[PDB]
Design a protein around this ligand. Structure first.
Ligand SMILES: [Cu+2]
Ligand SMILES: [Cu+2]
Lengths: 157, 157
Protein backbone atom coordinates (compact mmCIF):
# COMPACT_ATOMS: atom_id res chain seq x y z
CA UNK A 1 0.00 0.00 0.00
CA UNK A 2 0.96 3.65 -0.52
CA UNK A 3 1.72 5.91 2.45
CA UNK A 4 1.37 9.63 1.65
CA UNK A 5 4.17 11.90 2.88
CA UNK A 6 2.93 15.20 4.21
CA UNK A 7 0.75 17.49 2.11
CA UNK A 8 1.23 18.17 -1.60
CA UNK A 9 2.51 21.56 -2.70
CA UNK A 10 1.27 23.60 -5.66
CA UNK A 11 3.92 25.73 -7.33
CA UNK A 12 5.39 26.57 -10.70
CA UNK A 13 2.42 25.14 -12.54
CA UNK A 14 2.58 21.74 -10.79
CA UNK A 15 1.18 19.79 -7.88
CA UNK A 16 4.06 17.98 -6.18
CA UNK A 17 3.21 15.12 -3.81
CA UNK A 18 5.32 12.47 -2.12
CA UNK A 19 4.42 8.89 -1.26
CA UNK A 20 6.26 5.77 -0.17
CA UNK A 21 5.30 2.15 -0.65
CA UNK A 22 6.87 -1.29 -0.53
CA UNK A 23 10.00 -1.89 -2.62
CA UNK A 24 9.16 -2.52 -6.26
CA UNK A 25 10.90 -4.38 -9.10
CA UNK A 26 11.96 -2.13 -11.99
CA UNK A 27 13.15 -2.95 -15.50
CA UNK A 28 15.64 -2.45 -16.91
CA UNK A 29 17.48 -4.20 -14.07
CA UNK A 30 20.56 -2.72 -12.43
CA UNK A 31 19.55 0.94 -12.31
CA UNK A 32 17.19 1.12 -9.31
CA UNK A 33 18.21 -0.47 -6.04
CA UNK A 34 17.05 -4.09 -6.03
CA UNK A 35 13.83 -4.69 -4.11
CA UNK A 36 15.70 -7.27 -2.02
CA UNK A 37 18.01 -4.53 -0.71
CA UNK A 38 15.34 -1.92 -0.01
CA UNK A 39 12.62 -1.12 2.50
CA UNK A 40 10.56 1.45 0.54
CA UNK A 41 9.99 2.84 -2.94
CA UNK A 42 9.98 6.65 -2.59
CA UNK A 43 7.83 8.36 -5.19
CA UNK A 44 7.25 11.91 -6.39
CA UNK A 45 3.85 12.50 -8.01
CA UNK A 46 4.03 15.63 -10.17
CA UNK A 47 1.20 16.79 -12.48
CA UNK A 48 0.16 20.02 -14.14
CA UNK A 49 -2.15 22.42 -12.39
CA UNK A 50 -4.81 24.46 -14.23
CA UNK A 51 -3.40 27.10 -16.57
CA UNK A 52 0.06 25.55 -16.41
CA UNK A 53 2.29 28.37 -17.80
CA UNK A 54 4.42 25.96 -19.86
CA UNK A 55 1.54 24.46 -21.87
CA UNK A 56 0.96 21.21 -20.01
CA UNK A 57 -2.71 20.22 -19.82
CA UNK A 58 -4.21 19.98 -16.35
CA UNK A 59 -3.48 16.65 -14.74
CA UNK A 60 -0.86 15.58 -17.27
CA UNK A 61 2.28 14.07 -15.83
CA UNK A 62 5.19 16.51 -15.80
CA UNK A 63 7.97 14.76 -17.81
CA UNK A 64 11.74 15.17 -18.21
CA UNK A 65 12.19 16.72 -14.78
CA UNK A 66 15.51 16.36 -12.98
CA UNK A 67 14.68 15.36 -9.40
CA UNK A 68 16.94 14.60 -6.47
CA UNK A 69 15.88 13.81 -2.92
CA UNK A 70 17.32 14.41 0.53
CA UNK A 71 15.97 12.27 3.37
CA UNK A 72 16.84 13.15 6.97
CA UNK A 73 15.93 11.17 10.07
CA UNK A 74 15.45 13.99 12.57
CA UNK A 75 15.67 11.70 15.60
CA UNK A 76 19.11 10.32 14.68
CA UNK A 77 20.52 12.93 12.28
CA UNK A 78 21.22 10.50 9.45
CA UNK A 79 20.92 11.99 5.96
CA UNK A 80 20.96 10.28 2.57
CA UNK A 81 20.37 11.55 -0.92
CA UNK A 82 19.74 10.20 -4.39
CA UNK A 83 17.86 10.75 -7.59
CA UNK A 84 14.29 9.83 -8.43
CA UNK A 85 14.11 8.24 -11.88
CA UNK A 86 11.22 8.40 -14.37
CA UNK A 87 9.26 5.19 -14.74
CA UNK A 88 5.75 3.79 -15.15
CA UNK A 89 3.64 1.59 -12.87
CA UNK A 90 0.05 0.40 -13.03
CA UNK A 91 -1.23 3.76 -11.76
CA UNK A 92 0.83 5.75 -14.33
CA UNK A 93 4.19 7.45 -14.69
CA UNK A 94 6.13 8.92 -11.81
CA UNK A 95 9.63 9.60 -10.42
CA UNK A 96 10.82 7.00 -7.93
CA UNK A 97 13.57 5.06 -6.26
CA UNK A 98 13.91 2.02 -4.04
CA UNK A 99 15.62 3.01 -0.79
CA UNK A 100 17.17 1.03 2.05
CA UNK A 101 15.90 2.23 5.45
CA UNK A 102 16.17 -0.42 8.15
CA UNK A 103 18.51 -2.33 5.80
CA UNK A 104 20.94 0.56 5.33
CA UNK A 105 24.32 -0.64 6.68
CA UNK A 106 25.29 2.87 7.81
CA UNK A 107 22.30 2.78 10.16
CA UNK A 108 20.07 5.50 11.52
CA UNK A 109 17.33 5.15 8.92
CA UNK A 110 14.79 3.22 10.95
CA UNK A 111 11.30 3.95 12.21
CA UNK A 112 11.02 7.59 13.26
CA UNK A 113 10.51 11.20 12.22
CA UNK A 114 11.78 12.36 8.85
CA UNK A 115 12.23 15.45 6.72
CA UNK A 116 12.13 14.96 2.95
CA UNK A 117 13.27 17.47 0.35
CA UNK A 118 12.86 17.29 -3.41
CA UNK A 119 15.29 19.35 -5.55
CA UNK A 120 13.73 19.91 -8.97
CA UNK A 121 15.09 21.39 -12.21
CA UNK A 122 13.12 22.10 -15.40
CA UNK A 123 12.96 19.84 -18.47
CA UNK A 124 15.32 22.03 -20.54
CA UNK A 125 18.22 20.59 -18.54
CA UNK A 126 17.52 17.31 -20.37
CA UNK A 127 17.01 18.88 -23.83
CA UNK A 128 13.21 19.12 -23.73
CA UNK A 129 12.17 22.05 -25.92
CA UNK A 130 9.46 24.67 -25.76
CA UNK A 131 7.75 26.72 -28.45
CA UNK A 132 8.31 30.46 -28.06
CA UNK A 133 6.49 31.68 -31.15
CA UNK A 134 3.56 34.09 -30.85
CA UNK A 135 0.92 31.63 -32.05
CA UNK A 136 1.76 28.52 -30.01
CA UNK A 137 4.52 29.54 -27.64
CA UNK A 138 4.62 29.19 -23.88
CA UNK A 139 6.29 30.93 -20.96
CA UNK A 140 9.69 30.53 -19.33
CA UNK A 141 10.57 27.54 -17.20
CA UNK A 142 10.97 27.81 -13.45
CA UNK A 143 14.42 28.12 -11.93
CA UNK A 144 15.63 25.22 -9.78
CA UNK A 145 13.61 24.90 -6.59
CA UNK A 146 12.96 22.67 -3.59
CA UNK A 147 9.91 21.47 -1.68
CA UNK A 148 9.92 20.11 1.89
CA UNK A 149 7.76 17.57 3.70
CA UNK A 150 7.67 15.98 7.16
CA UNK A 151 6.34 12.51 7.84
CA UNK A 152 6.54 9.58 10.25
CA UNK A 153 8.21 6.51 8.76
CA UNK A 154 6.40 3.56 10.37
CA UNK A 155 8.46 0.78 8.77
CA UNK A 156 8.77 -1.04 5.47
CA UNK A 157 5.24 -1.74 4.14
CA UNK B 1 -2.85 26.50 -39.70
CA UNK B 2 -2.48 22.80 -38.82
CA UNK B 3 -2.50 20.20 -41.60
CA UNK B 4 -3.21 16.51 -40.89
CA UNK B 5 -0.92 13.92 -42.47
CA UNK B 6 -2.83 10.83 -43.56
CA UNK B 7 -4.89 8.94 -41.01
CA UNK B 8 -4.03 8.29 -37.34
CA UNK B 9 -2.86 4.82 -36.36
CA UNK B 10 -3.83 2.89 -33.22
CA UNK B 11 -1.09 0.44 -32.27
CA UNK B 12 0.56 -0.79 -29.08
CA UNK B 13 -1.94 1.05 -26.93
CA UNK B 14 -1.21 4.44 -28.51
CA UNK B 15 -2.83 6.79 -30.99
CA UNK B 16 -0.09 7.88 -33.43
CA UNK B 17 -1.08 10.91 -35.50
CA UNK B 18 1.02 13.10 -37.80
CA UNK B 19 0.53 16.78 -38.64
CA UNK B 20 2.54 19.66 -40.02
CA UNK B 21 2.25 23.39 -39.44
CA UNK B 22 4.32 26.54 -39.95
CA UNK B 23 7.94 26.55 -38.74
CA UNK B 24 8.23 27.33 -35.04
CA UNK B 25 10.80 29.15 -32.92
CA UNK B 26 11.88 26.77 -30.16
CA UNK B 27 14.12 27.05 -27.10
CA UNK B 28 16.78 26.29 -26.38
CA UNK B 29 18.21 27.81 -29.58
CA UNK B 30 20.32 25.48 -31.69
CA UNK B 31 18.73 22.14 -30.77
CA UNK B 32 16.58 22.26 -33.91
CA UNK B 33 16.72 23.79 -37.38
CA UNK B 34 16.06 27.53 -37.14
CA UNK B 35 12.59 28.58 -38.23
CA UNK B 36 14.40 30.94 -40.65
CA UNK B 37 15.66 27.96 -42.65
CA UNK B 38 12.52 25.84 -42.50
CA UNK B 39 9.13 25.62 -44.21
CA UNK B 40 7.18 23.33 -41.86
CA UNK B 41 7.17 21.94 -38.35
CA UNK B 42 6.67 18.19 -38.59
CA UNK B 43 4.89 16.85 -35.52
CA UNK B 44 3.88 13.50 -34.07
CA UNK B 45 0.92 13.39 -31.66
CA UNK B 46 1.15 10.20 -29.60
CA UNK B 47 -1.14 9.58 -26.62
CA UNK B 48 -2.29 6.61 -24.61
CA UNK B 49 -5.50 4.88 -25.64
CA UNK B 50 -7.93 3.28 -23.19
CA UNK B 51 -6.53 0.22 -21.43
CA UNK B 52 -2.94 1.04 -22.37
CA UNK B 53 -0.93 -2.13 -21.61
CA UNK B 54 2.02 -0.15 -20.17
CA UNK B 55 0.23 1.71 -17.39
CA UNK B 56 -0.36 5.07 -19.05
CA UNK B 57 -3.81 6.52 -18.32
CA UNK B 58 -6.08 7.27 -21.25
CA UNK B 59 -5.11 10.49 -22.99
CA UNK B 60 -1.68 10.85 -21.39
CA UNK B 61 1.19 11.92 -23.61
CA UNK B 62 3.54 9.05 -24.33
CA UNK B 63 6.99 10.35 -23.17
CA UNK B 64 10.62 9.31 -23.78
CA UNK B 65 9.82 7.76 -27.17
CA UNK B 66 12.51 7.67 -29.85
CA UNK B 67 10.89 8.82 -33.11
CA UNK B 68 12.96 8.82 -36.26
CA UNK B 69 11.32 9.90 -39.51
CA UNK B 70 11.89 9.39 -43.21
CA UNK B 71 10.23 11.88 -45.57
CA UNK B 72 10.20 11.02 -49.29
CA UNK B 73 8.87 13.04 -52.20
CA UNK B 74 7.67 10.24 -54.49
CA UNK B 75 7.44 12.58 -57.51
CA UNK B 76 11.08 13.76 -57.34
CA UNK B 77 12.71 11.00 -55.32
CA UNK B 78 14.04 13.41 -52.68
CA UNK B 79 14.56 11.67 -49.32
CA UNK B 80 15.52 13.11 -45.97
CA UNK B 81 15.85 11.61 -42.49
CA UNK B 82 15.87 12.97 -38.96
CA UNK B 83 14.47 12.64 -35.47
CA UNK B 84 11.53 14.35 -33.82
CA UNK B 85 12.43 15.85 -30.49
CA UNK B 86 10.22 16.23 -27.39
CA UNK B 87 8.89 19.69 -26.58
CA UNK B 88 5.81 21.56 -25.37
CA UNK B 89 3.49 24.08 -27.03
CA UNK B 90 0.54 25.96 -25.62
CA UNK B 91 -1.73 22.95 -26.35
CA UNK B 92 0.58 20.37 -24.77
CA UNK B 93 3.67 18.25 -25.33
CA UNK B 94 4.56 16.64 -28.62
CA UNK B 95 7.48 15.41 -30.74
CA UNK B 96 8.50 17.72 -33.58
CA UNK B 97 11.15 19.19 -35.86
CA UNK B 98 11.46 22.13 -38.22
CA UNK B 99 12.11 20.91 -41.79
CA UNK B 100 13.24 22.73 -44.93
CA UNK B 101 10.93 21.93 -47.84
CA UNK B 102 11.01 24.61 -50.59
CA UNK B 103 14.15 25.85 -48.79
CA UNK B 104 15.96 22.52 -48.84
CA UNK B 105 19.48 22.79 -50.16
CA UNK B 106 19.53 19.79 -52.53
CA UNK B 107 16.00 20.52 -53.71
CA UNK B 108 13.18 18.21 -54.67
CA UNK B 109 11.21 18.92 -51.46
CA UNK B 110 8.61 21.20 -53.00
CA UNK B 111 4.87 20.83 -53.37
CA UNK B 112 3.87 17.29 -54.34
CA UNK B 113 3.15 13.77 -53.15
CA UNK B 114 4.97 12.46 -50.11
CA UNK B 115 5.48 9.30 -48.10
CA UNK B 116 6.26 9.69 -44.40
CA UNK B 117 7.54 6.92 -42.12
CA UNK B 118 7.92 7.10 -38.34
CA UNK B 119 10.33 4.62 -36.73
CA UNK B 120 9.29 4.35 -33.08
CA UNK B 121 11.14 2.71 -30.18
CA UNK B 122 9.83 2.30 -26.64
CA UNK B 123 10.80 4.52 -23.71
CA UNK B 124 13.20 1.96 -22.29
CA UNK B 125 15.69 2.80 -25.03
CA UNK B 126 16.11 6.17 -23.27
CA UNK B 127 16.24 4.58 -19.81
CA UNK B 128 12.62 5.19 -18.79
CA UNK B 129 11.76 2.49 -16.29
CA UNK B 130 8.84 0.10 -15.76
CA UNK B 131 7.57 -1.70 -12.68
CA UNK B 132 7.39 -5.48 -13.22
CA UNK B 133 6.50 -6.71 -9.72
CA UNK B 134 3.12 -8.36 -9.37
CA UNK B 135 1.29 -5.71 -7.31
CA UNK B 136 2.23 -2.59 -9.31
CA UNK B 137 3.80 -3.87 -12.54
CA UNK B 138 2.70 -3.40 -16.11
CA UNK B 139 3.08 -5.23 -19.41
CA UNK B 140 6.16 -5.43 -21.59
CA UNK B 141 6.97 -2.67 -24.05
CA UNK B 142 6.28 -2.92 -27.77
CA UNK B 143 9.12 -3.91 -30.07
CA UNK B 144 10.37 -1.16 -32.44
CA UNK B 145 7.83 -0.59 -35.20
CA UNK B 146 7.04 1.73 -38.10
CA UNK B 147 3.95 3.60 -39.29
CA UNK B 148 3.45 4.93 -42.83
CA UNK B 149 1.51 7.95 -44.07
CA UNK B 150 0.83 9.32 -47.56
CA UNK B 151 0.07 13.00 -47.99
CA UNK B 152 0.11 15.97 -50.38
CA UNK B 153 2.36 18.83 -49.29
CA UNK B 154 0.72 22.12 -50.33
CA UNK B 155 3.35 24.56 -49.02
CA UNK B 156 3.79 26.38 -45.72
CA UNK B 157 0.33 26.75 -44.04
CU1 LIG C 1 8.66 3.59 -9.36
CU1 LIG D 1 7.19 21.49 -31.74
Amino acid sequence: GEVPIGDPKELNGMEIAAVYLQPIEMEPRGIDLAASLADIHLQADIHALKNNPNGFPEGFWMPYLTIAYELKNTDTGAIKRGTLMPMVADDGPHYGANIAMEKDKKGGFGVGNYELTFYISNPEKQGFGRHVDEETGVGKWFEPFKVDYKFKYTGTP
